[PDB]
């Protein structure tokens, strides 16, 4: 009744079990918690979910077709009983303080809370986040409209007042930045009151692999093209609610062009170039307004590695 956790999962049965165990080690009264696991028509997860059910009130929904992370999260939102919903992607983990650290804010009058994010480069558990290898963390306060510029967190970091009660859902046409579109839909479409909670963190696993052993393929260009396209899509859909954020939006195509040129020249970008761009854009939104040529230079240093 108090909290529903929504875990969409697709051919990751091993990682799903790590995510579910991180729910089992929540410091929380399990009487007030329901877990909804949504299999997006991948390989079965009944055994994983059966195991977690020994300690949790878990429900498995089997999608009859692969609909995407948007479709699968909606499947969970439609059936969620909790006053508040907490998203968890099957390859991230909660810290034990995930709900004890956010629920006071939601009950006190927030509708939307996001916590710090540790971008973990090695696989960790819910009780072992501090053991993660971490080069960058997403800990941006909510005082400059960075969210109006571009996405600076991920669903696993979000606890929010029931989107079904608001009639607010994920857009199934978006396969990338669907979460950004959704957060803007709550914040601007439904006037959710957003609050940052820096005392709580999750682990979001971004394990490097082969790409930095090879070079930019024409698929890094294809994927960025779709990212760029959806970014323009959502920008048109949700106008910035401040003129400063509206001006800083114009830096993202500058950054995209820099990225394309690098890819085309066969030169890889920093593995965290997006997150280093967040830091540049967060500065461009505040304090004294830097010049546009200074910011264009910082984007350069951000995409290089420095
Ligand atoms: O067709 C898909 C692809 C992914 N997912 C789920 O959506 C979440 C986010 O997917 P992923 O981790 O690949 O997203 P990213 O971290 O790249 O945003 C995970 O729980 C996936 O299992 C899904 O339900 N259907
Ligand atoms: Mg993921």
Place of tokens 């390859």: 91
Tokens of 305: 């590695």
Q: Give the technique used to solve this structure.
A: X-ray
Q: Is 292 labelled a binding residue?
A: no
Tokens of 174: 């978006």
Q: Is 89 labelled a binding residue?
A: yes
> How many CA atoms lie less than 13 Å away from 241 in the CB half-sphere?
13
Ramachandran category for residue 268: left, alpha or beta (phi over 0 → left; psi -120 to 50 → alpha):
beta
In order of start, what are the domains of the chain with their CATH numbers?
A: 3-205 (3.90.550.10), 218-304 (no CATH)
Q: Is 177 labelled a binding residue?
A: yes
Cα 225 to chain center, whole Å?
A: 20
Nearest one of 124, 34, 118 to 83, comparing CA atoms: 34
Ligand 1 atom with the smallest distance to the CA of 7 is 20
In whole angstroms, give the CA distance from residue 129 to residue 156.
14
The set of long-range contacts for 102-106, using a CB threshold of 8 Å and a minimum separation of 24, is 102/159, 102/197, 102/200, 103/2, 103/3, 103/159, 105/195, 105/197, 106/159, 106/160, 106/161
Torsion sign over Cα 188, 192, 193, 197: negative
In whole angstroms, give the CA distance from residue 299 to residue 7.
35
- Three-state SS for the chain is CCEEEEEEECCCHHHHHHHHHHHHCCCCCHHHEEEEEEECCCCCCHHHHHHHCCCCCEEEEECCCCCHHHHHHHHHHHHCCCCEEEECCCCEECCCCCCCCCHHHHHHCCCEEEEEEEEECCCCCHHHHHHCCEEEEECCCCCCCHHHHCCCCCHHHEEEECHHHHCCCCCCCCCCCHHHHHHHHHHHHCCCCEEEEEEEEEEEECCCCCCCCCCCCHHHHHHHHHHHHHHHHHHHHCCCCCHHHHHHCCHHHHHHHHHHHHHHCCCCCCCCHHHHHHHHHHHHCCCCCCCHHHHHHHHHHHHHCC
Ligand 1 center to residue 9 CA distance, Å? 7
Give the ligand with the smallest distance to the CA of 76: 1
Q: What burial class does residue 281 get, using C-beta atoms within 10 Å of its C-beta: 0-12 exposed, 13-18 middle, 19+ buried?
A: buried
Q: Is the CB of 12 under 6 A from ligand 1?
A: yes
In whole angstroms, give the CA distance from residue 84 to residue 67.
24
The set of long-range contacts for 245-252, using a CB threshold of 8 Å and a minimum separation of 24, is 245/144, 245/145, 245/146, 245/148, 245/149, 245/285, 246/148, 248/149, 248/281, 248/284, 248/285, 249/148, 249/149, 249/150, 251/149, 251/280, 251/281, 251/284, 251/295, 251/296, 251/299, 252/149, 252/150, 252/281
Close Cβ partners of 48 (under 8 Å, ≥ 6 residues apart) = 13, 16, 17, 20
Q: What is the resolution of this structure in A?
A: 2.2
Q: Is the CB of 89 under 6 A from ligand 1?
A: yes
Ligand 2 center to residue 298 CA distance, Å? 28
CB 283 within 8 A of CB 292: no
The 10 Å Cβ neighbour count of residue 233 is 15
CB 7 within 8 A of CB 49: no
Ligand 2 center to residue 131 CA distance, Å? 19
CB 53 within 8 A of CB 45: no
CB 123 within 8 A of CB 209: no
Ligand 1 atom with the smallest distance to the CA of 92 is 12
CB 36 within 8 A of CB 4: yes
Tokens of 92: 């991230």
Collect residues with CB below 5 Å from ion ligand 2.
89, 91
Q: Is the CB of 171 under 6 A from ligand 1?
A: no
Tokens of 228: 């760029």
Q: What are the angstrom distances between the C-alpha of 216 and each of 168, 219, 267, 271, 300?
A: 37, 8, 6, 12, 17
């Amino acid at each position: 009744m108090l909290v529903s956790v929504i875990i969409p999962t697709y051919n990751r049965p091993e990682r799903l079990a790590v995510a579910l165990q991180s729910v089992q080690t929540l410091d929380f009264d399990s009487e007030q918690l329901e877990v909804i696991v949504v299999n997006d028509h991948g390989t079965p997860v009944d055994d994983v979910v059966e195991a977690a059910g020994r300690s949790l009130n878990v429900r498995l929904i089997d999608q009859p077709s692969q609909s995407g992370p948007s479709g699968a999260r909606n499947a969970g939102l439609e059936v969620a009983r909790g006053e508040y919903v907490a998203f968890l992607d099957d390859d991230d983990v909660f810290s034990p303080q995930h709900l004890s650290g956010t629920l006071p804010l939601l009950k006190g009058g927030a509708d939307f809370v996001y916590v710090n994010i540790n971008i973990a480069r090695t696989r960790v558990t819910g009780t072992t986040i501090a053991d993660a290898e971490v080069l960058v963390r997403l800990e941006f306060p909510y005082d400059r409209g960075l969210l109006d510029v571009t996405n600076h967190f991920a669903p696993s970091a979000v606890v929010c007042r029931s989107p079904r009660s608001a009639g607010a859902f994920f857009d199934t046409a978006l396969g990338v930045e669907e979460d950004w579109d959704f957060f803007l839909r709550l914040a601007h479409g439904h006037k959710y009151r957003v609050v940052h909670q820096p005392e709580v963190a999750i682990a979001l696993h971004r394990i490097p692999g082969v790409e930095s052993l090879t070079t930019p393929t024409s698929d890094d260009i294809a994927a960025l093209k779709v990212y760029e396209d959806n970014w323009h899509l959502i920008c048109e859909r949700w106008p910035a609610a401040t003129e400063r954020a509206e001006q800083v939006r114009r830096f993202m195509p500058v950054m995209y062009q820099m990225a394309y040129a690098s890819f085309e020249a066969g030169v890889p970008l920093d593995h965290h170039y997006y997150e280093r761009t967040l830091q540049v854009l967060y500065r461009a939104l505040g304090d004294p307004q830097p010049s546009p040529a200074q910011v264009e230079d910082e984007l350069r240093a951000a995409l290089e590695g420095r």
